[PDB]
Write a protein that binds this DNA or RNA. Structure first.
Lengths: 203, 102, 98, 147, 201
RNA sequence: ACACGUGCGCGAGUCGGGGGCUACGAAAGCCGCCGUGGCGCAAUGAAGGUGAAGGCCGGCGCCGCCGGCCGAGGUGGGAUCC
RNA sequence: GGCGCGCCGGGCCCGGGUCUUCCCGGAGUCGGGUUGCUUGGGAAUGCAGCCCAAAGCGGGUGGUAAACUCCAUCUAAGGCU
RNA sequence: CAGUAACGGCGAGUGAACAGGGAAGAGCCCAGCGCCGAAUCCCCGCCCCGCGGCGGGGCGCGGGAAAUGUGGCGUACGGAAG
C-alpha cells in the first residue's frame, strides 16, 4: 500500500524532497488566516492513524499557533512576590503548542468535537497543525457504532480537558515508577488522597 | 557429596523445572520484515540523505570515524544510536566502493 | 467491667452534631483600631442599619461564632476489646440469675 | 470527661494555671522544633544526640521485602511444631528426629540463643547463625538449607 | 518548645487540612450499600457462583511472600490450551483469563491445568434454550441440584506436605551449613574478578 | 502525635481498627484458611553483613577432632519464708 | 416499567484442531542537549519552550553519570470502556 | 506499607512506591499490512407499516460522499489464506 511509502517518506524531513514541500506549503500556510478550514487532510496517511475515515461529517481545520514559550503577563515585569516568582521571560506553558492548536479549533467549532491533530509545518514564528474535527450530529457518525462514542455528552470539549492525545501528554499520566504523582485520576486526584485525613469513626 | 538448595550465592533460588515456551508475539516487533526493508531501501533512493549524514560521510571519506563518531553523538542523540549510524553510514559507503569498481 | 463496657459502647449509636463552619464568619467585619473610644472588636462595615459598627468576630460578641466550634470529626465512637465485651455479658447474665 | 479535668478546678482563679508574670502567650519559644541549633540547643544536645547531620549511604528505591529475614531463636524452636512431636520424639525406639520447617512457621533465619533440649532435630531453615549450627550439631541434629 | 525528655515528633498539619477531613459516618451505610448490591447481583447471576469466575493458583512475587499462594487475575493462555479450553469460550463458562500471565514453571502450569480439570468436572452447564438440551450441555436430574456457590469458587488453600521423622544420615550431620552460606556469598561476589584475573593470568 | 502515671482485659503474645456474615439498631453478635498488617518477641553496623553461657572426665606435664555425664554465673545487702 | 412461555416479520448462512506458505505496526515523534517549572525522585521523576534529530535482532524501562557485555521486561508516539 | 525510602539554608519542614489483605472485577476497537468488481455511507420522491427517542420494508439510468480509501475479515493474546 501507498500509505507505508508516504509514512517513511514523511520520516525523511531533512531530504531535498520534503524540505521543498515542508517549506513551500509553510509559505502557503502563513498567507492564510490563523484558523481556516482545510478542504482535506494535508497528510491523508497520518489522518488514517489518528482516526480520520474520509466520510461525510469528518472535518479538518488547519490552525497555526504563534511559536515560543510563555512570558508571565505582569505589568512592566514586576511580580510583587518573593525572588522565586520574580521570573517572567524564560517560563514555559504546561501544555504543548499542538494542544493550544486543538483547543482553538474546538473552541471556534463548538458544535463539532475534536478527535486528534498532527504537525504539518514550523517556522521561526509559527507551528502549523491540521486538527481532525468530527460532527456528533451527522448520521454517518451518529449511526456508526464504533464512532458514536464522540456523539455522547461525556465527550463535549475533549480538547479543553486534556482528553485529546496531544492534550493528555501535558498531565504526566501512564503506568509505572515515572508516573506516581498522577496515580488515581490525575495530578489533582493524587494530591487529594495524600492530603486527606481518613479520620475513621472508631480509630 | 550432596548440597542443599541455598537462598543466597552464585546459583541461588528454589527448584523449578522450566517449560519450553514460545516467546510471545509482542517480542518480535521492530524485526526487519522482507517487505518493509524494500520500502525504506526504495525511499532511500527517492529521498537521499540528511545533511548531517552527508557531513558524517565526508568525515569517513577522509577516514576520521572518531571525529565522525563525536559528530553523530551530538547530531542523532546517544552513543548507542551514533555507533549504529556510523556502522550503517559506512555500509552505504562500502557499496560506493563496490558500485564504482565494475 | 459491666460499667466500663456499657459506657463506651453506648457512644457508638451516637450521631454527630456540629455548629456550621461559616457561622459567625459570614460578615466583612474589621476592627476600628486604636482610637474612637471603642474596645478594638472587629466591627461590622458601615451602613444605615443596626449592625453597622456592632462587633462580629469573637466568642463574646452578639451574633458571632462560639469558642472552638464543635466539629463532626470529634471521636464519637469508643472501641472496646472483644474479651472485655464478652466479660461484660459473662457477669451480666450471672447477676441475672441472682 | 470534661468534668474530671483541671479546667473545672481553675474557674474562680485568674491566670487559669499559666502564671501571673509570664502570661500564657501564643508561641514564646517559636513553633514546633525551632531554634534546635540556636536557643533550644541544650534540650537537643541533652535528649536528642545525633539529631543534626548526615551519616551513611543514600539507598534511593529501598523495597522492605528484598531485606526480609525474620529470625527465631533456639529458645522457642520447638514451639513451631506441636507439643505431641517433642513427646513422640523421646519415647519412640528408632532414633528418628522430627523436622522443624522454620520457613513453614514464617521465619527465614535460626539464631542460637536458648538451651536446646537434648533430643535430635532436622531444621529446614533458609539461613543459620554460626552458634545455632553448633547447638543443633551438639544436641545431634541437621541444619538443612532450603530456598 | 520542648519541655524535657520528649520524642522529636513532626505533625503534618502545616497545610489547610481541616477542609480535607474524610469522616466515616458513611461506613455502616456503605457496608449495607455494598451488601444490598452484592445480594441483588447474586440473585441476577442466578444459578452461577456468587463470588464470580475461578481465579488461578498464583505465587506471590518478592522473597518475603513467595512461600504463600494467592488467587490470580486470570488463567494463562497455555494453562487453557494444555487443559483444552478456548480463550474466548473460557470467559462465557465462568473462567478468568489474562493474556499477560507467562508460565516460567511446569509446577504452576500443571497445577493450574489440573485446576481447570477439577473446575470443568464441577461445572453444571444449562442449555441456551430450556426446551432444547443441545450436545454440549448436562442432564435434567444433574441440572436441578444447581445452587449458587457462597464464598470464592474452589478456595485456594496454603498447605505443606506431610513429611515424617527421619534417622539423620552422616552427610546431614556433617553438612557445615553456616560456612556453606558464607562461601556462597564470596563465590557470588568475587566470581566476576576471578574470571577477570583468569583473563589477565 | 508523643510521653508518663493510673484502671481494665488478655498475656509472648495482643489487637479487627479495614472488610465480610447475619423502631431501638448508623447499635450489638460473629469470623481465625479474614491476623493481611501493626506493635512486641533481637540487637548492631555507614553498609557488605553478622546476630546473644560453659567448664570437666577421657581416646590421639598438653593440643583439634573423637566421646561421656552433669551444667543459665559470682559477691555484698536484702522485705518474706525455713 | 421489568421478566421469560408459544407464533410470526426481516436480518445471519458463521465453527474447532493440527499442518505447511506468507503478513506483521502509529516520526518534528522518540531520543539527546539546553532552559524554566515541577516532584520523594537525589549527575535531572514529570511537564513544557527552543535547538539537534532517530532506529528496526529495533526501541523504552531496569530509582548514580559513562563505556563494554550478557540478561530481564514490556510494545511508545491512535481509540473505546 | 509509612511518617518509611527519599527530599530539605540535610534547618523549619516535606514525603511516595511496590509487595500483601480487601471493595469491585470485563474487556476491547482501529490505522497500518493485505484480500475480495466500493462489496460502504448520507440525502431526496412516491407507496406501506409506524414510533411524542424519525425508525422499518420497498421503489426509482434519483442525487451526492468516497480509490487523496468506505465496508467486511483482522490488531501484538498473534493474524490471514490454502
Amino acid at each position: 500500500g501507498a500509505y507505508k511509502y508516504i509514512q517513511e517518506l514523511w520520516r525523511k524531513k531533512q531530504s531535498d524532497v520534503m524540505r521543498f514541500l515542508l517549506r513551500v506549503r509553510c509559505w502557503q500556510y502563513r498567507q492564510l488566516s490563523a484558523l481556516h478550514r482545510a478542504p482535506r487532510p494535508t497528510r491523508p496517511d497520518k489522518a488514517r492513524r489518528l482516526g480520520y475515515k474520509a466520510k461525510q461529517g469528518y472535518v479538518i481545520y488547519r490552525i497555526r499557533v504563534r511559536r515560543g514559550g510563555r512570558k508571565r503577563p505582569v505589568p512592566k515585569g514586576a511580580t510583587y512576590g518573593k525572588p522565586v516568582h520574580h521570573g517572567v521571560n524564560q517560563l514555559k506553558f504546561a501544555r504543548s503548542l499542538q494542544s493550544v492548536a486543538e483547543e482553538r479549533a474546538g473552541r471556534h467549532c463548538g458544535a463539532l468535537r475534536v478527535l486528534n491533530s498532527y504537525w504539518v509545518g514550523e517556522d521561526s514564528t509559527y507551528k502549523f497543525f491540521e486538527v481532525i474535527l468530527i460532527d456528533p450530529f451527522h448520521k454517518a457518525i451518529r449511526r456508526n457504532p464504533d464512532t458514536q462514542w464522540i456523539t455522547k455528552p461525556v465527550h463535549k470539549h475533549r480538547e479543553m480537558r486534556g482528553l485529546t492525545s496531544a492534550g493528555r501528554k501535558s498531565r504526566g499520566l501512564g503506568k509505572g515508577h515515572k508516573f506516581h504523582h498522577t496515580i488515581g485520576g490525575s495530578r489533582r486526584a493524587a494530591w487529594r488522597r495524600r492530603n486527606t485525613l481518613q479520620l475513621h469513626r472508631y480509630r | 557429596a550432596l548440597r542443599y538448595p541455598m537462598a543466597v550465592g552464585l546459583n541461588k533460588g528454589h527448584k523449578v523445572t522450566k517449560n519450553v515456551s514460545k516467546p510471545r508475539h509482542s517480542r518480535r516487533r521492530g524485526r526487519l520484515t522482507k517487505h518493509t526493508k524494500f520500502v525504506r531501501d526504495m525511499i532511500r533512493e527517492v529521498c537521499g540523505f540528511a545533511p548531517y549524514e552527508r557531513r558524517a560521510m565526508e568525515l569517513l571519506k577522509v577516514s576520521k570515524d572518531k571525529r565522525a563518531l563525536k559528530f553523530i553523538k551530538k547530531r542523532v542523540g546517544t552513543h548507542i544510536r551514533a555507533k549504529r549510524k556510523r556502522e550503517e553510514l559506512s555500509s552505504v559507503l562500502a557499496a560506493m566502493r563496490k558500485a564504482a569498481a565494475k | 467491667i459491666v460499667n466500663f463496657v456499657h459506657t463506651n459502647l453506648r457512644k457508638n449509636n451516637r450521631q454527630p452534631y456540629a455548629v456550621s463552619e461559616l457561622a459567625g464568619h459570614q460578615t466583612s467585619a474589621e476592627s476600628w483600631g486604636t482610637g474612637r473610644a471603642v474596645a478594638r472588636i472587629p466591627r461590622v462595615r458601615g451602613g444605615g442599619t443596626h449592625r453597622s459598627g456592632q462587633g462580629a468576630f469573637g466568642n463574646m460578641c452578639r451574633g458571632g461564632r462560639m469558642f472552638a466550634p464543635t466539629k463532626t470529626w470529634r471521636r464519637w465512637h469508643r472501641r472496646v476489646n472483644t474479651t472485655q465485651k464478652r466479660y461484660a455479658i459473662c457477669s451480666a447474665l450471672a447477676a441475672s440469675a441472682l | 470527661p470534661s468534668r474530671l479535668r483541671k479546667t473545672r478546678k481553675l474557674r474562680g482563679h485568674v491566670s487559669h494555671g499559666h502564671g501571673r508574670i509570664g502570661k500564657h502567650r501564643k508561641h514564646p519559644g517559636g513553633r514546633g522544633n525551632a531554634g534546635g541549633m540556636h536557643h533550644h540547643r541544650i534540650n537537643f544536645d541533652k535528649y536528642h544526640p545525633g539529631y543534626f547531620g548526615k551519616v551513611g549511604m543514600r539507598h534511593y528505591h529501598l523495597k522492605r521485602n528484598q531485606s526480609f529475614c525474620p529470625t527465631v531463636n533456639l529458645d522457642k524452636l520447638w514451639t513451631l511444631v506441636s507439643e505431641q512431636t517433642r513427646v513422640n520424639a523421646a519415647k519412640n525406639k528408632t532414633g528418628a528426629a522430627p523436622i522443624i520447617d522454620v520457613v513453614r512457621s514464617g521465619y527465614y533465619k535460626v539464631l542460637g540463643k536458648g538451651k536446646l533440649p537434648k533430643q535430635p532435630v532436622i531444621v529446614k531453615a533458609k539461613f543459620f547463625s554460626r552458634r545455632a549450627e553448633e547447638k543443633i550439631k551438639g544436641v545431634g541434629g541437621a541444619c538443612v538449607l532450603v530456598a | 518548645a520542648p519541655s524535657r525528655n520528649g520524642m522529636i515528633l513532626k505533625p503534618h498539619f502545616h497545610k489547610d487540612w481541616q477542609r480535607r477531613v474524610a469522616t466515616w459516618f458513611n461506613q455502616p451505610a456503605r457496608k449495607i450499600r455494598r451488601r444490598k448490591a452484592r445480594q441483588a447481583r447474586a440473585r441476577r447471576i442466578a444459578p452461577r457462583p456468587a463470588a464470580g469466575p475461578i481465579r488461578p493458583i498464583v505465587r506471590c512475587p518478592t522473597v518475603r511472600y513467595h512461600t504463600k499462594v494467592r488467587a490470580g487475575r486470570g488463567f494463562s493462555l497455555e494453562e487453557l490450551r494444555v487443559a483444552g479450553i478456548h480463550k474466548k469460550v473460557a470467559r462465557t463458562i465462568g473462567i478468568s483469563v489474562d493474556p499477560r500471565r507467562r508460565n516460567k514453571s511446569t509446577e504452576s502450569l500443571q497445577a493450574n491445568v489440573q485446576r481447570l480439570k477439577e473446575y470443568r468436572s464441577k461445572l453444571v452447564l444449562f442449555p441456551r434454550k430450556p426446551s432444547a438440551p443441545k450436545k454440549g450441555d448436562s442432564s435434567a436430574e444433574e441440572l436441578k441440584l444447581a445452587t449458587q456457590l457462597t464464598g470464592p469458587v474452589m478456595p485456594i488453600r496454603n498447605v505443606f506436605k506431610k513429611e515424617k521423622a527421619r534417622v539423620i544420615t552422616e552427610e546431614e550431620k556433617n553438612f557445615k551449613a553456616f560456612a556453606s552460606l558464607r562461601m556462597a556469598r564470596a563465590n557470588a561476589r568475587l566470581f566476576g574478578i576471578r574470571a577477570k584475573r583468569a583473563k589477565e593470568a
